[PDB]
Design a protein around this nucleic acid. Structure first.
Ligand code: MG
Ligand code: MG
Ligand code: MG
Ligand code: MG
Ligand code: MG
Ligand code: MG
Ligand code: MG
Ligand code: MG
Ligand code: MG
Ligand code: MG
Ligand code: MG
Ligand code: MG
Ligand code: MG
Ligand code: MG
Ligand code: MG
Ligand code: MG
Ligand code: MG
Ligand code: MG
Ligand code: MG
Ligand code: MG
Ligand code: MG
Ligand code: MG
Ligand code: MG
Ligand code: MG
Ligand code: MG
Ligand code: MG
Ligand code: MG
Ligand code: MG
Ligand code: MG
Ligand code: MG
Ligand code: MG
Ligand code: MG
Ligand code: MG
Ligand code: MG
Ligand code: MG
Ligand code: MG
Lengths: 87, 70, 116, 101
RNA sequence: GUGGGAGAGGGUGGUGGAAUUCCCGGAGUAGCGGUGAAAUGCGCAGAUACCGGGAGGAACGCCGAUGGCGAAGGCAGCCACCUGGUCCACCCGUGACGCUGAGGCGCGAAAGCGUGGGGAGCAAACCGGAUUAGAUACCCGGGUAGUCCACGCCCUAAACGAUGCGCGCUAGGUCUCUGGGUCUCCUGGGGGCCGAAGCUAACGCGUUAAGCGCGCCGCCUGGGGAGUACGGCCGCAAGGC
């Protein structure tokens, strides 16, 4: 799945500053990572519906955080979206 | 009557290969003993059941037995 | 014409009948009896007295074959499931051991509407 | 690569040529699928609780290994294809939960 | 975020034993089965019972609980892989990013439909045997669809805690599941049972509120007519809204 190696790689990649863990950018990054993992898990296993509900909730949370970022600072929002390739 | 854990050492509940101690937790038949006679907690019993099934599939513990004197 | 001198005895008891099969130490049968082998025809076959008479008749046929030492296997439940073993004990056959080997599934097949 | 425990129960009546052959075939299967062998315990002749393949006994093997995950099932299949191997149970390694501590 | 944890949560593939049925063989006679009694039925072409071997399908005994998981439907052999939800400790990061939610979209037991597989046991319809004033039923013997799998529909239910979601406040006692702790105990988070205040028409509810408050959604306005008619939408149809 997602081990601490890949997780820490992404976190240190998307940190606003050294030591930051829960920035909106990092939250959306880890969210999108698990999103892509699940959506590739749902390319196969079309009959896995509960994991699909989990994917729905993850999409919802990522979209809420992106809406918040767009409301607060649009430029960092554009940077994040272009960096992750969403929307 | 004595419960199994009361007369036993500091043994591994996750070792499916030790038939000597896993045999203590089976009944006269191949049935797994309830918690009344094993003296185990819920978690301990839940682990013991899976280890017993593992040992059964490896031909170490009997799936079922025959009752005597009936 | 066999002179077996030792063997097993299987008691299959139900709520409609009880039957006894006397066999040799490696599984092949020698004689047998039931509530219908003896006079009883209907539900009378399921009574403990019919089980006693069936066990005794099978035991005497085993005597004709020359049976002395007998191991007992029991499968099923019904009236006279025990009376068969009591008569088999007092029949003149030295009972080696009694065993209940009633086959019970691990929840494999769906029963009839009567059994649910 | 995760840690696994491979239990192998095979025919007991083998002599030394056959037994060494089957064991080296298991070794080649472990090599071909990337199974680093951490330790090995060979119990051998043991009295089974129920007959397996018409035989009341069996020969036992236990390998603690570290190998990639997505190859474990294919390795298990290739280990099962052998005729003399009657039982294959690959188990993910775990810590010794104790009782009556 | 970090670090731990429990679990029939879901999907995929593999795999184990018990039992039923069937087939091969051995040995073995005269019945078995079934019921309140019986009869149909099966058996001399050798049944039932017993032993060994083989095939196939379906379901997972003991563990098992008054237990656990899930949003609900619902989810129990074992193994591996893929994956969801959740809880606790640390007090680390962001800094109101929240709650609810018409519509929409997705899920949705069983039965039912379509195409193709599969088929042991069970079994609507049906075929017989009984019972009875009659038996179109209950009881017995057979037996098809179906039950099972793949894919696509169907969107119903006592889909029940007959109790929408979220948050805060308001005695405790007792049993329990799972974490943490300086571990007669305390502290979280779930599952029950008594019971303060209070509520209720009463039964009863009572920190798992049916109490005290707030936000938002759904629904109700006498019974029959009737979940019927017409209209629309959806559906292959049954039919549903
Ligand atoms: Mg009868
Ligand atoms: Mg093999
Ligand atoms: Mg599960
Ligand atoms: Mg599963
Ligand atoms: Mg035959
Ligand atoms: Mg005939
Ligand atoms: Mg006839
Ligand atoms: Mg005929
Ligand atoms: Mg077939
Ligand atoms: Mg139970
Ligand atoms: Mg998980
Ligand atoms: Mg802080
Ligand atoms: Mg700050
Ligand atoms: Mg919501
Ligand atoms: Mg809606
Ligand atoms: Mg449905
Ligand atoms: Mg269905
Ligand atoms: Mg169909
Ligand atoms: Mg039937
Ligand atoms: Mg009639
Ligand atoms: Mg019928
Ligand atoms: Mg309300
Ligand atoms: Mg503790
Ligand atoms: Mg729950
Ligand atoms: Mg509590
Ligand atoms: Mg309580
Ligand atoms: Mg009062
Ligand atoms: Mg109460
Ligand atoms: Mg409340
Ligand atoms: Mg009220
Ligand atoms: Mg209405
Ligand atoms: Mg009116
Ligand atoms: Mg209707
Ligand atoms: Mg219409
Ligand atoms: Mg139309
Ligand atoms: Mg209707």
């Amino acid at each position: 799945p997602i081990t601490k190696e890949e997780k820490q790689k992404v976190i240190q990649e998307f940190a606003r500053f050294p030591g930051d863990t829960g920035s909106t950018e990092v939250q959306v990054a880890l969210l999108t990572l698990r999103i892509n993992r699940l959506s590739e898990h749902l390319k196969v296993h079309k009959k896995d519906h509960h994991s699909h509900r989990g994917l729905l909730m993850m999409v919802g949370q990522r979209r809420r955080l992106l809406r918040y970022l767009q409301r607060e600072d649009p430029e960092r929002y554009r940077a994040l979206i272009e960096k992750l390739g969403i929307r | 009557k004595a419960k199994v854990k009361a007369t036993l050492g500091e043994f591994d509940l996750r070792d499916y290969r030790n038939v000597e101690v896993l045999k203590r937790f089976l009944s006269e038949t191949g049935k797994i003993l309830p918690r009344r006679r094993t003296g185990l907690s819920a978690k301990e019993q839940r682990i013991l059941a899976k280890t017993i099934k593992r040992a059964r599939i490896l031909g170490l513990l009997p799936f079922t037995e025959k009752l005597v004197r009936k | 014409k066999r002179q077996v001198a030792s063997g097993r005895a299987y008691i299959h008891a139900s709520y409609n009948n009880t039957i006894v099969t006397i066999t040799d130490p490696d599984g092949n049968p020698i004689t047998w009896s039931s509530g219908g082998v003896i006079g009883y025809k209907g539900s009378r076959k399921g009574t403990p007295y019919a089980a006693q008479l069936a066990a005794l008749d099978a035991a005497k046929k085993a005597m004709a074959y020359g049976m002395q030492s007998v191991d007992v296997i029991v499968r099923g439940t019904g009236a006279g499931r025990e009376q068969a073993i009591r008569a088999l004990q007092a029949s003149g056959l030295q009972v080696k051991s009694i065993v209940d080997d009633t086959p019970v599934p691990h929840n494999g097949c769906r029963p009839k509407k009567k059994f649910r | 690569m995760r840690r696994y425990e491979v239990n192998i129960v095979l025919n007991p009546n083998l002599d030394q040529s056959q037994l060494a052959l089957e064991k080296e075939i298991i070794q080649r299967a472990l090599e071909n699928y990337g199974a680093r062998v951490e330790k090995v315990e060979e119990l051998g002749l043991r009295r089974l609780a129920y007959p397996i393949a018409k035989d009341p006994q069996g020969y036992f093997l236990w390998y603690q290994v570290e190998m990639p995950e997505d190859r474990v099932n294919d390795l298990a299949r290739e280990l099962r294809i052998r005729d003399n191997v009657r039982r294959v149970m690959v188990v993910k390694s775990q810590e010794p939960f104790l009782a009556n501590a």
